[PDB]
Ligand binder design. Structure first.
Ligand SMILES: [Ca+2]
Ligand SMILES: [Ca+2]
Ligand SMILES: [Ca+2]
Lengths: 219, 219, 219, 219
């Protein structure tokens, strides 16, 4: 039966049927957004939803008999396994985020269509050439975040009262979002010299980000 | 009579006469901004307007004889038809935006002057080389915008209550505009982990956006 | 006497004596900032100022005999002329910005020193290959600024009441400064669809601005 | 004993032991953040901290015998000296930042592990190409800041009262952070024309910065 199903699986119709289902389930989940639509046709939605999840498990079952170990060594394959997995956890218990993480299956439209795969892969491909810097930054963030927590988190615990918060705040300064009037100006009403901490910080972190951008304009 | 008018239309004088009306009508439309100017010379400029709109339809009518099916296959030409057409719809009824859309005819200074035409075309040509990325992002937005609406729209309907509002809010976070103490920090007062949605969101969407600019610094 | 003075003017001493005066006057101007320093050594600094102003006119006089027609055709020279002229307008009368524009003489350190000259010139030379785009943008701003004054100016005059006010607002949105919470969200409390005016505006204006940056990494 | 020690110091195991201590003292400093942790394991860590500091002074002493004058001419060596020297100053007297600047020793994970040094050096190397511009700007910032103080610091001393305050404000306007609603709009309720000072200031300073980024994407 193997070469029967391997012919079924590899069939354009099967792929196109899958891609068709995604773009239908995509449309379905945007309608699940409306409180109106849900009162009207929620049942229609929840069963069509449960149907699709079965069909996707069927497919993923078939897809593995036809690739075995080659499958679990394929990123894209792995992804699809993992996304439908989430979608499988019951409509109750644990963390309600799961019910929400389900919408991640609309990322299968990226996986099931090349060019997208191309583009995604084009994008991803740039990452390893950056991990040298990224690690540099995270070391930097970590070091300043600790200075911040023990320089400012007593009078300003919302922003710096905890390592986690200093990170968050330092990240915010880095996106340069409301970073003067929002955070540094106030800091200075108590600590005149907070500009000595954050102006160097800004320079470093912005400079680095410019280099990292130009690095992707080279390789 | 064809070659008579095909010599009128195709003439230098004709083109430079059209350009002369545009830069005149453009100056006329900025004087219609002032409530003062309108109480004195308002009548002058309303007629001057109807005059030019005639002249432009006369011209467009002429322009079509001289070109026929060639004309409805030229972008720049089509534009001028559509823009003058908008300028024809009576100063009443339906919606008033059409009265406001009339100011789009000053885009003819682009259409009817090279260099501008050149420069506009330079920019536009880059678009098809982005459409892979653009599509990617829209799918990304769509996925997150749905996830946000069902994670935050109950307590925070201003921002995430409707699919569209999540789109809007998400675009805002992307421009990195007051996303911290303007959206995220609030959200957190209720959903401590909301950083886990938005910090990732930010990496991806800024990352991508960096690439898309590096692409346009290659082609 | 000409070649005697033409030897004074071209003299390394003279050149370096000017450079010496600038950096001294510059330091003098940041001391004039302090209310304290002015209550102590104000008269010192006022005379030291009038002195230098003569020295710079004497020089610019000497400089002209030595160069004649050649001098009013040298950018860096013309500047130096005009910027000293400003410094000559009596410590009174007309506008008091003239008392303030006097600190533009410290832009002579750019003129009277190469490398600076080099770099400034390097920068400036990019401008002409941008005027095609800059033109395009101005037309765009002007078109959208008009629309906005006749679409939000009536209820929202602080931000769109006048053609000038809209230009400013539009410039603010373009720099993405508080554009959503500060501008578009409010607007939208009255005009639900203002987003249809601003999101496109923002795409266009930033796209164009991306190109112009890549343009200065082609040339 | 020189070659005995020159073989200890230069040894891989000595390096890998130093890197191992950094990564441990690193972890331990992010734990000293928790007030909880300090009330339980505080003594453990303060002792652990004083230990490593000796080990680092021992090492830095050893490192010097093995290199002599070659050592105080190596950036990376000097750094480690100065950072450990700070850490040597007793847990008392003076400013309190020295007790905080102590966390700068986690910058040794950069100095004493290749790849970072590479990347760091790749960064720094770019700086010399920038110092021509950087200077230009700093003359500019100095010039406008003086103008600003005498144009706006009487009504608006928070932001422009002092030469230093204007620096800071100008820096802020440059990062484009809340610059309209937060600074320039206000100024305008008193000085209608301040946009004439800040629109140009913004152009100039953003232009320059675009070049400077394009400069680094070529050299
Ligand atoms: Ca910003
Ligand atoms: Ca901002
Ligand atoms: Ca803000």
């Amino acid at each position: 039966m193997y070469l029967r199903i391997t012919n079924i699986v590899e069939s354009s119709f099967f792929t196109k049927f899958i891609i068709y289902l995604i773009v239908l389930n995509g449309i379905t989940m945007g309608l699940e957004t409306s409180k109106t639509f849900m009162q009207s046709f929620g049942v229609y939605t929840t069963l069509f939803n449960q149907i699709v999840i079965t069909i996707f498990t069927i497919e993923i079952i078939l897809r593995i008999y036809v690739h075995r170990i080659s499958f679990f060594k394929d990123p894209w394959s792995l992804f699809d396994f993992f996304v439908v997995a989430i979608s499988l956890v019951p409509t109750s218990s644990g963390f309600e985020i799961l019910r929400v993480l389900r919408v991640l299956r609309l990322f299968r439209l990226v996986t099931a269509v090349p060019q997208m795969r191309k583009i995604v892969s084009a994008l991803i491909s740039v990452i390893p050439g950056m991990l040298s810097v990224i690690a540099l930054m995270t070391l930097f963030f970590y070091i300043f975040a600790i200075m911040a927590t023990q320089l400012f988190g007593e009078r300003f615990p919302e922003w710096f009262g905890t390592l986690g918060e200093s990170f968050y705040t330092l990240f915010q300064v880095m996106t340069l979002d409301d970073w003067s009037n929002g955070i540094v100006r106030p800091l200075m009403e108590v600590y005149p010299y907070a500009w000595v901490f954050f102006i160097p910080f800004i320079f470093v972190v912005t400079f680095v980000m410019i280099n990292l951008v130009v690095a992707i304009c080279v390789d």
